Amino acid sequence: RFLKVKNWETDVVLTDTLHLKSTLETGCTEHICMGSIMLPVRTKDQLFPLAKEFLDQYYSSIKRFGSKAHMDRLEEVNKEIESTSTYQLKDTELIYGAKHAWRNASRCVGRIQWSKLQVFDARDCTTAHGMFNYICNHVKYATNKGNLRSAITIFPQRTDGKHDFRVWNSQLIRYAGYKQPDGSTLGDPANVQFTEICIQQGWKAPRGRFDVLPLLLQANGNDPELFQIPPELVLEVPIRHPKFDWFKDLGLKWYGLPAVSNMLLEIGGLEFSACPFSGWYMGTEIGVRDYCDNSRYNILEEVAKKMDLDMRKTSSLWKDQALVEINIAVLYSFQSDKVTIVDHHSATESFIKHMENEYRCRGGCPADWVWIVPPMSGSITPVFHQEMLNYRLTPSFEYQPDPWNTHVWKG
Amino acid sequence: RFLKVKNWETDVVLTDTLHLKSTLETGCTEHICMGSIMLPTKDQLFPLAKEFLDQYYSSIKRFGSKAHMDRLEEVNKEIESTSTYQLKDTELIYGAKHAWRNASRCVGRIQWSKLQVFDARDCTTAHGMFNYICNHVKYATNKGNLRSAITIFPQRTDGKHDFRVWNSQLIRYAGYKQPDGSTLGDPANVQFTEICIQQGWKAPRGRFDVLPLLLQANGNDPELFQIPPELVLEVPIRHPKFDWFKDLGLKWYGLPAVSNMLLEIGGLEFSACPFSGWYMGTEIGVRDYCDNSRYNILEEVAKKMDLDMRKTSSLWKDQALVEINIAVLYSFQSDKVTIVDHHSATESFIKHMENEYRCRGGCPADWVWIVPPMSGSITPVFHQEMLNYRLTPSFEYQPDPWNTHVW
Ligand code: HEM
Ligand code: HEM
Ligand SMILES: C[C@H](O)[C@H](O)[C@H]1CNc2nc(N)[nH]c(=O)c2N1
Ligand SMILES: C[C@H](O)[C@H](O)[C@H]1CNc2nc(N)[nH]c(=O)c2N1
Ligand SMILES: N=C(CS)NCCC[C@H](N)C(=O)O
Ligand SMILES: N=C(CS)NCCC[C@H](N)C(=O)O
Ligand SMILES: [Zn+2]
C-alpha cells in the first residue's frame, strides 16, 4: 500500500511507502487521534530479531545485503546474544545508527543536516568524571567558536537497567530557575526542580537570572556527581535589537549551543540512556518559547511596556508586535556575534526540500506537523501547508523518565 | 483507555470519557498518524436513527420514557415503509446545534447552543433557495451585529435529487486568471468563477467582485442569482497608524458563511446546509490576505513600511503580518462589525473545553486546525493537549457538485 500527502500551496503530491516499515505504535487508533499529546532490562527474547532488522538495513545502506560480511555479522551477533545476552555494535554500525535516529526523528525540522553528524564514541567510559571529560570535548568541538557543528556523544548502553549511564540535565547548557518565597521565580522556571536537586547535591547557586547549571552526571548506575562546565567553553550571546537601544537594558542573554541530554537512543534493540546531542538554534526556540511562553522567562509584558504599546486590549495585537521585535533581536544578536542560528523561514523551506528529497530517495519522511510548524507565523511558512505522515522508525530517539524519579540511591 | 489531556502552560488535566462514544473512523491507525491530512440502505438507517433519538431523549431527560419508545417505534415504522424518515423540528434544531458542538475544527464552539436554525425543508426550487439564503444573510448580518445561523434544505433521498449550494461560501470574491499569467481577485475561486462565467454571469473583472449564488434544487441544473448588494456588508481596510494602508484598496466581507458542507443527523443527509458565525481576525488577515496562493499582499505591505526585504532573517514578513492583522481587527471594530481576535477566541475555546469536559466528559478538538496561523504558542490552545474523534451529528466534507452533476 502507498499513501499520498499533498501540499496545499503548490499542489505537489508525494507518495509514501516508507511507513510500511513502521514497527512501533503511534498512540492513535481508528477512533482517536493523539497527534497532539506530548508523550503518548530487555531480555534475549526480543533481542536477536531487533538486531537482525537493524543489521539488514545497515548492510542494505552499504550495498552489502546478503554478502558474506553480512551473513557472518548476523551469525556473530547471534552467538554473542546467546552467549553474553546482549551484543556490541561496531563503530561503523554505531555511526550509521546515530545518523538514522536523527533522520527518523519526526519532530525535528533540522533533519536536512542528518548525514553530517559528528559521532563521538564514549562507550569505553566508566565514571562520571570520564563523562564530564567527554562532555567538555563535545561542547568545545560543537561550539567551534560560534560556527556550530552537529555532534552526538554516546555513553555505554544499558545492560541490566541497574547500571545506567545518565546525564541528569535536560540539556548540557541551561539556566537555573529558583522559586522565591513570594511565589515568583528567579531565572528559568522550566529548570526549578532540576536546580533544587543540584542545590541539594551540593551546588553553590549564584542565584541570578542566567546561571549556567552544573552538569549532574551518573555513570554505571552509581549516584550522580556535580561538575561545572568551564565558563570559557560556554558561549553566550547578549541580546540587543538593531533599532531599540533600550532592548540591551533588559539584561537578556542566551547560550549558543542547544544540546538535548535526556533522550534515549535505540539502535538494533540496544538502549543508550546517555546520548547527549547538539545542533544549532532556530531563532523561535529562544525568541518565542524560551523568552515568551508564560511558564518560561515571559518577557512579553516588559518588552511591550518599553514599546509603549496599547496593552489595555489584546485586539491591539500588542503581544504579537512585541513577539516579532524579540525575535528580530534574537536573530540579530546571534548573527552579529557570528554564532550559528537559522530563522524559521529559512529552516522550514530547507525542511520541505529535505522532505521532498527523502520521499524521492527513501520512500518517505516521518514528520510531526504539530512540532514541525513554528510557534509564530505558522501559515507564512511552507510547512503549515504541507500534509505529513507521522510514524515511528528505528533507529530512534525516545523519551525516558527523569532519573530522579527512578534512580535507587546508593546514599 | 479513559484518557487524560494536559495543558502544559497550566497543568490543568482533564479526563476524557466522551470519546468512548466515537463512531466514525479518524484516518489514523496504531502505525500512522494522519492528524495533518486535510481530508482523511434501509439496514443502515435504523441504527443511525436509534443512536440519535437515544441521545435526543437523553438530552431532555426522557430517556427510556414512553414518548422515547413511541418515537423509536414511529421512526422505525416510517423507515420500514418509506425507506427514510422525517425529523421533528425539535430533533432538527438539537441535531444542528450538536453538529456544531461536535465540529472538532471549530474554535468558535463556545457559542454552539445559541444557533438559529432555519428550517427550509419545504423548499422546492433554486428561486426558493435564493429567498431562504437572502433571509439567512440578512438575519445573520444584523447590521454588523452578527448572529449565528444555519439554513437546512431538504435531505438526500436517492442521491439523484440533491439540493446543493455550489458556492463554497455564500459570500466570496471572484478570481480571474490574467493575459500575463497572474491572477486578479481571489485565486482560490478561479475555477468557480469560471463555472459562473461559463454559466452566464457577466464578471465585472475586478479585485473584489462578490460572486453570484449558484444554486441547485432537487438535482436540477443549478442557477445563478445575484445577492442584493445591500445585504453584503463589506469593510474597507485601513490601519490605525499607517495612512497609506487604505491606498492598498483592500476590503473584506463581514459574513463568513460556509455553504459546501454536508450535515448528517440521525443518518439523514442534508447536502445543502449553509451556516455562518463571524470571523476570527486571522482568517482574513493571515490566510486570505497573506497565504501565497490567496491575495498574497505581504511584499507590497512590507515595501510600503520600508522593511529590509533583502533577508528573511529581518522577519519583514512577520512584521508586515502583525500590521495587516491589526488593520483587519481595527477596521471591523471601527465599523462596528462583529470580529474576534485570535487571543480572545482561543481563551474562549479553553474555557469551553473546560465546560465540556465538566458537563459532557470531553470535547473533540483538532489541534492542527484550532491553533491560529499566527503567534501559535502565545495563545493558550498551543499548550493544550486535544483528543480528536468523530461524534455524530456532524458536518462532513463532500465532493464539489461540478464533479458529480449529470447535466
Ligand atoms: C542542526 C540543527 C538542528 C535544528 C535547527 C533542529 C531543529 C529542531 C527543532 C526546532 C526541534 C523542536 C525542538 C523544540 O521545539 O523543543 C527539534 C527537535 C528534535 N531534534 Fe532537532 N534540530 C537540529 C539538530 C538535531 C540533531 C543533531 C539531532 C540529533 C542528533 C536532533 C534530533 C531532534 C529530536 C530527537 C527532536 C525531538 C525533540 C523532542 O521530542 O523533545 N536534531 N529539532
Ligand atoms: C461564532 C463564530 C465562529 C467562529 C469564530 C468560528 C471559528 C472557526 C474557525 C477559525 C474555523 C477554521 C476555519 C478555517 O481556517 O477555514 C472554523 C471551522 C469550522 N467551524 Fe466554526 N466558527 C464559528 C461559528 C460556526 C458555526 C455557526 C458553525 C456551524 C454551525 C461552525 C462550524 C465549523 C466547522 C464545521 C468548521 C470546520 C470547517 C472546515 O473544515 O472547513 N462554526 N470555525
Ligand atoms: C500540547 C502540544 O502538543 C504541545 O504544546 C507541543 C505543540 N507543538 C510543539 N512544537 C515544538 N516544536 N515544541 C514544543 O514544545 C511543542 N509543544
Ligand atoms: C496541511 C495542513 O493540514 C493544512 O495546512 C491545514 C493546517 N491547519 C489549518 N487550520 C485552519 N484553521 N485552517 C486551515 O485551512 C488549515 N490548513
Ligand atoms: N535546535 C535544537 C537541537 S535539536 N534544539 C533543541 C531543543 C532546544 C530548546 N527548544 C530550547 O529552546 O532551548
Ligand atoms: N468563522 C467562520 C465561520 S465557521 N469561517 C470559516 C470559513 C471562512 C474562511 N476561513 C475565510 O477566511 O473566509
Ligand atoms: Zn493521529
Overview of the structural elements:
- 2 copies of one chain form a homodimer.
- By secondary structure, the first copy, chain A, is an alpha+beta fold.
- The first copy, chain A, has 3 domains: 16-123 and 150-160 and 264-278 and 348-372, Nitric Oxide Synthase, Chain A, domain 1, CATH 3.90.340; 124-149 and 164-235 and 399-403, Nitric Oxide Synthase,Heme Domain,Chain A domain 2 (Nitric Oxide Synthase,Heme Domain, Chain A, domain 2, Alpha-Beta Complex); 236-258 and 281-346, Bovine Endothelial Nitric Oxide Synthase Heme Domain, Chain: A,domain 3 (Alpha-Beta Complex), CATH 3.90.1230.
- Chain A has helices at 44-61, 68-84, 91-103, 128-143, 192-201, 283-292, 300-307, 318-336, 344-362, 369-372, 403-406; strands at residues 3-6, 13-16, 118-121, 151-154, 166-167, 177-179, 185-187, 215-218, 225-227, 236-238, 253-255, 259-260, 264-267, 270-272, 277-278, 281-282, 341-342, 396-398.
- A 4-stranded mixed sheet of chain A has the order 3-4-15-12, sandwiched between helices. A 3-stranded antiparallel sheet of chain A has the order 5-8-9, with helices on one face.
- In chain A, a hairpin with a 6-residue loop joins strand 8 and strand 9.
- Chain A is globular, with a radius of gyration of 23 Å.
- At the A-B interface, strand 1, helix 6 and helix 8 of A face strand 1, helix 6 and helix 8 of B.
- One protoporphyrin IX containing FE is lined by residues 100, 103, 105-108, 111, 115, 148, 150, 258, 275, 277-278, 280, 283, 340, 345, 369, 395 of chain B.
- It is classed as oxidoreductase.
